Amino acid sequence: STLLPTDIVGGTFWLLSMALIGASIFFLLERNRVDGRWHTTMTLLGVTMLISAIFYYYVQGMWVDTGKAPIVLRYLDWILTVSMQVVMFYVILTAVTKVSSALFWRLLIGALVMVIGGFLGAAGYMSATLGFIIGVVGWLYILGEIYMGEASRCNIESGNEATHMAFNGLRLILTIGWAIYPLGYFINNLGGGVDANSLNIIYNLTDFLNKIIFGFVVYRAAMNDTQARLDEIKK
Amino acid sequence: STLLPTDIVGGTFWLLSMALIGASIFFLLERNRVDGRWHTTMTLLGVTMLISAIFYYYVQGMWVDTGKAPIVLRYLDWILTVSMQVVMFYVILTAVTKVSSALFWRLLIGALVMVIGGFLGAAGYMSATLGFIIGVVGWLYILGEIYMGEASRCNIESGNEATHMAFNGLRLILTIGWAIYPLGYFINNLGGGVDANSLNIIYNLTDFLNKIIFGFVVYRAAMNDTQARLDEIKK
Amino acid sequence: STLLPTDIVGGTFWLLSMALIGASIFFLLERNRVDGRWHTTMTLLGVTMLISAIFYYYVQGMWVDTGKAPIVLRYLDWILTVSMQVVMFYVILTAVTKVSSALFWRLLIGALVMVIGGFLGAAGYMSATLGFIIGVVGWLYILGEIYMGEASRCNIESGNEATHMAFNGLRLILTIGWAIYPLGYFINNLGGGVDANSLNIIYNLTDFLNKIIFGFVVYRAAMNDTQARLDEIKK
Amino acid sequence: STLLPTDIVGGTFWLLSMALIGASIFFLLERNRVDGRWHTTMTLLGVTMLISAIFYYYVQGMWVDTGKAPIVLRYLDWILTVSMQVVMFYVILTAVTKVSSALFWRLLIGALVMVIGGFLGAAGYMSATLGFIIGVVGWLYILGEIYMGEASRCNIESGNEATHMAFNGLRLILTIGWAIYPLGYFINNLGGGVDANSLNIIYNLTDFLNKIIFGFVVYRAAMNDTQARLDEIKK
Amino acid sequence: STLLPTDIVGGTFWLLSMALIGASIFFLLERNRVDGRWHTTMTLLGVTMLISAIFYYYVQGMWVDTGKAPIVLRYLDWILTVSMQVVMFYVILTAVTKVSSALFWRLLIGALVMVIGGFLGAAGYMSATLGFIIGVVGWLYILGEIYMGEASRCNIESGNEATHMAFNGLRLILTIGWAIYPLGYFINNLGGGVDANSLNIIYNLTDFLNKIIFGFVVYRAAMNDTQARLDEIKK
Ligand SMILES: *C/C=C(C)/C=C/C=C(C)/C=C/C1=C(C)CCCC1(C)C
Ligand SMILES: *C/C=C(C)/C=C/C=C(C)/C=C/C1=C(C)CCCC1(C)C
Ligand SMILES: *C/C=C(C)/C=C/C=C(C)/C=C/C1=C(C)CCCC1(C)C
Ligand SMILES: *C/C=C(C)/C=C/C=C(C)/C=C/C1=C(C)CCCC1(C)C
Ligand SMILES: *C/C=C(C)/C=C/C=C(C)/C=C/C1=C(C)CCCC1(C)C
Ligand SMILES: CCCCCCCCCCCCCCCCCCCC
Ligand SMILES: CCCCCCCCCCCCCCCCCCCC
Ligand SMILES: CCCCCCCCCCCCCCCCCCCC
Ligand SMILES: CCCCCCCCCCCCCCCCCCCC
Known part of the structure; x- marks a missing residue:
């Protein structure tokens, strides 16, 4: 009875493909309902999801x-x-x-x-160690920017409550959510190793949560700010 | 002459794929004609149908x-x-x-x-009994919410006649329509069993009715409320 | 030299697929140019054609x-x-x-x-005779409605010249055009029989005329009424 | 290493498919920027190209x-x-x-x-001679209409400079451009014959010019007239 | 471990397909946010990317x-x-x-x-030398136009700051970016020769940069000019 990991691998590839094409259409269709200042945000959100959906369509094949x-x-x-x-x-x-x-x-x-630092280490073009190190340096920059950099200071000075919530939420995705991938890389490459079937499941599930929760965080920011402006127009 | 169940299985997968892509495009195109307060309702309706259509496209393959x-x-x-x-x-x-x-x-x-409670019981990750029990508890919550919870009280206090009809109709789908799936699970898993071909037909037909009737109920609510507002504007 | 019916069968399946995807996009794109009262008419018209196009895509495969x-x-x-x-x-x-x-x-x-009456008779679930009879009763109702029923009386009392033309044209399609299908069923099932290749051609051609002429009749009604209103606004 | 005609045949089928899907999207997206009187012109232009693109997708398969x-x-x-x-x-x-x-x-x-006159002669249902004759009679009507018929006189009386340019340009396509196809038919059927690999190249290239130049001629007419009207509004 | 060029070839074909379908949708969706004078620019940008995405879909197959x-x-x-x-x-x-x-x-x-000059030299229809020469003459014209021709003089006289930036940026792409392709042709054909696997990678990467950077340069021009106009309207 018990489904085999192999079964769950190709199932999750379908799940991901459906969920991401769904989120894509939803964000691209709701881009017309946010204040115009949020149109590029919503267009980039829907196109990110579309790109990932197309990937999963290729991979499922x-x-x-x-x-x-x-x-x-x-x-x-x-x-x-x-x-x-x-x-x-x-x-x-x-x-x-x-x-x-x-x-x-x-x-x-x-x-x-x-990404490139980790690719070079995964493809074999350089030690996976040096791949990890270059990858983590790249991450820790990004975190450094958004926690204690111009991005963080610009957030504080914006005065936008929507942009405050977005930042607080995206920063948390990029810190906890995105920590799965490095972990994977470490265990698979620098460590013992993981069956690719099992690592395809974990990555498939993490993508579902690190791309949907990201999208909904950003969509709420655009929808909340849009409404805030309409409510201040009414007053 | 008599068509074999196997024939009717792959035929119904086509029916479901066509009907749900059709309903999807219809709800997404008519989302521009409902009052803007109904735009997310109509965007979620069309994207629900699109997700299911993509599933049936995969499965027919x-x-x-x-x-x-x-x-x-x-x-x-x-x-x-x-x-x-x-x-x-x-x-x-x-x-x-x-x-x-x-x-x-x-x-x-x-x-x-x-869903997860039943998946665990169907995949083999836990007794189908405990799968059923966890699944039914999940359902009975949802029914509890929409019959005697905040959702029900909010409906009563809305004063919206459209939202009254929607609720009355969706509650009926979720109570009768959705009772097929648990039944299936019981007979197939906790019971003697069904022949999978037969259960694919029943589930294919039930999906046609539990997704179209759901969609049309919600679409009528959005269309009816839109008009109600226009008629009060005219007065 | 003479092309074989088999050749014409798969050719006509392509024709039908192209023509119907074309008509679909055309009716869905022109839905924005008709008076809003005609938007559901035009959305249902385009989605009917899309559903049929998807069928022919499946069948050609x-x-x-x-x-x-x-x-x-x-x-x-x-x-x-x-x-x-x-x-x-x-x-x-x-x-x-x-x-x-x-x-x-x-x-x-x-x-x-x-349709269901004829399916049951074609699939083998009941005598094709009783299939025919139930099918024809279903048709003759529909004709009864649109010739001497509420649909006919509502047409007369509408006073809409566009709706008069539509009705007269659609009722002619449903009376003459749609009489091919019962005929087919009779000859194939209740009669001697027809090669499926030949009947696939006839049905393919009849679909081209009973779906395009239907669409253009309805589109002219929506376009004519839209203009009539604009011309009365100008006066 | 001189590419073989067979190589160029399937290459040109790709070219045609890409070019025509491109032209289609371009004309359907620019339909919103022409004066509304030109919306059906632009919708028929884009749908013509889409239909041809779908054909070439089938044929390349x-x-x-x-x-x-x-x-x-x-x-x-x-x-x-x-x-x-x-x-x-x-x-x-x-x-x-x-x-x-x-x-x-x-x-x-x-x-x-x-088209039907030539199909009957190509498919074998009648002498290719009688196919040619019926085809050419059909053409010479169309030319007769647009050179010396109601279409020509209506053009003169329109007073529209855009419609003058369009007509002059489309008339030239239908006279010179479209003369390739009859020629092909003659040489292939009534004449010696052409390898179908070579005739697929000529027809592929002629379609590129008789469908793109047609589209751009019509698009310029719609865009030029739109602007002419805006320039007279400014004055 | 080290991934083989063959692996990177079909990977990059996927990358290119995804990136270019993404850029296409993004430019076609943001076409509605630029000043209307920039609508054809944005429609041609999105359709260029779509045409190339379809190519890479064919080639990956x-x-x-x-x-x-x-x-x-x-x-x-x-x-x-x-x-x-x-x-x-x-x-x-x-x-x-x-x-x-x-x-x-x-x-x-x-x-x-x-392009045609180089095709003739690559297909074998003429010496690759004469292919190169005709290709380079074609390029050097284009460069001649945009550096010291009517295009360059029209840019100077426009007074548009956006069109200044676009020109300077596109001129740089056409001069440096596009110099890779001739180089490829020279080394592969007129020179020693290159494995097609290696040249497919280089061309795949160069396309990613010569089509994305081109698109973003043009998109910034349209977005910057749009805003400049809004800012002068406010003053
Ligand atoms: C939607 C997919 C996402 C967000 C993937 C995230 C990927 C990373 C955060 C990868 C990080 C890596 C490191 C920090 C170390 C080296 C290996 C990587 C590339 C996996
Ligand atoms: C469009 C598809 C729908 C609405 C499917 C509905 C599914 C359910 C209501 C499933 C319910 C189940 C239980 C209540 C018990 C355990 C087994 C399940 C998951 C089939
Ligand atoms: C677009 C396809 C159309 C309009 C098909 C029409 C189908 C019918 C009118 C079928 C009628 C039948 C009867 C009246 C009796 C025998 C069984 C049927 C279903 C073929
Ligand atoms: C986009 C494709 C086009 C415009 C094809 C044009 C086709 C014709 C003009 C065909 C004409 C023919 C004759 C005048 C004689 C008989 C043979 C035909 C059908 C090839
Ligand atoms: C998006 C793809 C692009 C921009 C490709 C650019 C292609 C060229 C600039 C090709 C140039 C060539 C020459 C100048 C010499 C002869 C060989 C060619 C065609 C490769
Ligand atoms: C090397 C280039 C390719 C890198 C990977 C692809 C993603 C690149 C980033 C896309 C950016 C989308 C457009 C954002 C424009 C922001 C405008 C804001 C107002 C000034
Ligand atoms: C049982 C299978 C049925 C499948 C086809 C469904 C056909 C009905 C769908 C009709 C959708 C449009 C209904 C719109 C009603 C507009 C007028 C409402 C009253 C003002
Ligand atoms: C092959 C048999 C015929 C079907 C092929 C398509 C036939 C032509 C379709 C024309 C569709 C557009 C018609 C627009 C009519 C505009 C009328 C304006 C009147 C004021
Ligand atoms: C063989 C190559 C085919 C494609 C080349 C041509 C592609 C671009 C043509 C479409 C864009 C032309 C738009 C002209 C806009 C300006 C017209 C002048 C008056 C403002």
Whole structure:
């Protein structure tokens, strides 16, 4: 009776594909109902989800056919979608306040180091140790920016209550949620190893929570700020 | 001559895929004609149907190829779409009245227990008995909320005639319509068993009625309330 | 040289798929240019065509692979799209006048008896004779409604010239156009029999005319009424 | 290493598919920026291109698999898309002037005779000679209409400079551009014959020019007229 | 461990497909937020990305199946997408200033010579030398136009700060970014030769940067000019 991990692997790939195409359409359709200052935020949110959905459509095909789906495949999605998620901190701030363009590049370059540093270590192009180290340095920058950098100070000075809640929530996703992936990398590569079937499940589930909760956090910020403005217009 | 159950299984998978993509596009296109307070209701309705349509597209492929479509596959759709349907009670109330956000989480957690409780019992991760029990407890919460809870009291105090009709109708779907699935689980798992082909037909037909009637109930509420408002504007 | 019927079967399946996806997009894109009272009419028109297009996409796959496409497959499309076409008489009337909701259910139930009555006779679940009889009773109701029923009286009392033209045109499609299908059923089932290849061609061609002419009749009504109103606004 | 015609055949099928899906989206997205009188013109333009794109998607599949793509397959696209292109002369005139609806039917029937006349001769259902003759008679009508008929006189009396340019340009496409297809038919059927690999290239390239140049001619007319009106509003 | 080039080839085809469908949807959805004078610029930007995404969808299929993806396949995409990118210089200028239509044709013909000149040399229809020479002449025209031609003079006289930034940025892409492709051609054909696997990677990466950076440059111009206008309206 007990379903085999292999069964759960290709099931979760379907789940992820459906959930993310759903979230995508939902965020792209509700982009017309947020104040216009939030339109790019909502367009980037829906397109992030669409990109990830297309990844899972590709991967489910590779699983159905070949029966294998390596973990290095992820760095295609991540190179795209981690980048877009870290940029969301800038896009959200520009919605409500004025921030230097430099924040955009610090954040993006920080994401690119995290993913590329780990890819090089996973693909074999360099020691997985040096892969981990470069990846963690990339992360700790991003965290450094959003906790004690221009992004954090810009948040405080915005005065936007929506942007306060967004930041507090996205920062928590990027700190706890995103800590699964490094862990995975460590155990799989620098450690004993994990069956790829089992690591495909964990990554599939973590993606469900680190992409949906991210999306809903940002969507509530856009919807709450939109309403706040309408309520102040009424007064 | 007599078509074989196997024939009717893969036919109904097509029916369900066509009907649900049709209902999806219809609810997403008519979302621009309802009062704006009903836009999220209509966006969630169309995206629920799209998610289910994508499921049936996946499953029809598995059937066409392998010739088998297990009943545990359903919990991918259900984990997504049951959740969204139970949340519709909150989304509808927030359209017309003021309701605690806590209701959102009581309802969602209630759905997650129902589906996950049954998945664990169907996958083999726990006795199907304990699966049933946990599933039914999850349901009876949801029913408890919408019959004698904050959702029910908020409905009464809304004063919205549309929200009255919606509730009365959705409550009936969730009580009678949704009682097929537990029944299935009982007979298939805790009972003698069903032949999977037969249970795929029943579930395919029940999905047609528990997703279309749900959608049309909610669509009529949004369309009726929209008009009510226009008629009071004219006065 | 002479193309074989088998060649024309899979060709016509492509034709139908293209024509119906084309008509679908055209009716869904032109729904924004008709008076808003015609928006549901145009949304149902485009979604009817989309549902049929998806059917033909499925069937062309079955043909390309298996080389066979049974005639009982049609009742998937028909159960959906015949229902929607018979309801169009109600949706059009509610665009321009006030009609009882009962008409909706008389019409829908009439369609469901027609298709289901014939499915049961085609699938083998009952004598094809009793299938025919139940199917024809279902049709003759629908005709009875639209010729000498509430639908007919509501048309006369609407005073809408567009709704007069629509009715006259749709009632002619439902009387002459739709008489091919019963004929087919009779000859194939109650009669000697028809090669499925030949009957797939006839049904493919009849669908092209009974779905396009239907769509264009309804689209002209919506476009003509829209303009009539603008011309009276100018005066 | 000179690429083989077979290589160029399936390459050009891809080209055509991409170009036509691109033109389709472009015309359907720019339909919102033309004066509303041009909305049906632009909706028919985009849907013509979409229909042809879907054809080429089907055909590329047949090529990739079977390695053969007969030239009689074209008459599926042509029956749809030639009809729509000849009707564009009516749709454009009704945008800017008042024209009898009879022109619509003369033009459509003229197209249907051209394609069907040639199909019957290509499929084998009648002498290719009689196929050619019936096809050319159908064409020469259409040319007769647009050069010396109601379409030509309506153009002159419109006074629309955009409709003058469109007509002059579409007339040239229908006279020179469309003369490739008859030629092909003659050489392939009434003449010696052409390898279907070579005739698929010529037809693929001619479709690229007789569908893109057609589209851009019509799009410039809609965009030029839109602006002309805005410039006269400013004065 | 070290991933094989073959692995990276089909991975990058996925990346490119996802990134370009993402950029496409993003540019087509943000088309509604730029000043209307920028709507064609944004529609051409999104459709360029879509055309390239569809190419990579085709090519990934050819790789997955056949295991080979020749470098001559590229000229299908390039004939379309290079053309559209060189025309963007005209479309952008017409957004903000008055420019002769002749520039459109000089630019387009210049692109067509570049790609076709190289195709003829790659396909074998003429010496790769003469292919290179004709290709480089085509390029050097385009550069000549945009550096010291009507396009450059029109830019200077526009007075638009957005169009200044766009031009300077696109000119840099067309000069440095686009210099990789000629290099490839030279080394592969006129030179020693390169494994197609390696050249597929380089071209895949260069496309990611020469199509995204192009798109973001143009999008910033449209977004910056839109805002500049709003800011001057406020004053
Ligand atoms: C939607 C997918 C997401 C958010 C994935 C997140 C990925 C990371 C945070 C990866 C981090 C890594 C390190 C910090 C160490 C080196 C290995 C990585 C790339 C897995
Ligand atoms: C659109 C699909 C729907 C609404 C499915 C509904 C599913 C349920 C109501 C499932 C309920 C179950 C129990 C109450 C007991 C345990 C077994 C379940 C999960 C089938
Ligand atoms: C778009 C497809 C259409 C309109 C199909 C129409 C189908 C019918 C009118 C079927 C009628 C039948 C009878 C009246 C008796 C025998 C059984 C049927 C279902 C073929
Ligand atoms: C987009 C495709 C187009 C415009 C195809 C055009 C087709 C024709 C003009 C066909 C004409 C023919 C004749 C005039 C003679 C008989 C053979 C035909 C059908 C090829
Ligand atoms: C999005 C794809 C792009 C921008 C591709 C650019 C292609 C070129 C600039 C090709 C140029 C060539 C030459 C200048 C010499 C001959 C060979 C070519 C076609 C590769
Ligand atoms: C000034 C107002 C805010 C505008 C922000 C624009 C954000 C657009 C989306 C950014 C996408 C980032 C790149 C993601 C892909 C990975 C990196 C590719 C380039 C090297
Ligand atoms: C003013 C009263 C309401 C007028 C508009 C009603 C709109 C109904 C549009 C949807 C009709 C769907 C009915 C056909 C469903 C097809 C499948 C039925 C299978 C049982
Ligand atoms: C004021 C009147 C304006 C009328 C506009 C009519 C628009 C018609 C658009 C659709 C034309 C379809 C032409 C036929 C398509 C192919 C079907 C014929 C048999 C192959
Ligand atoms: C063979 C290559 C085919 C594609 C090349 C052409 C693609 C771009 C054409 C569409 C955009 C033209 C828009 C013109 C806008 C300005 C018109 C001048 C008056 C303002």
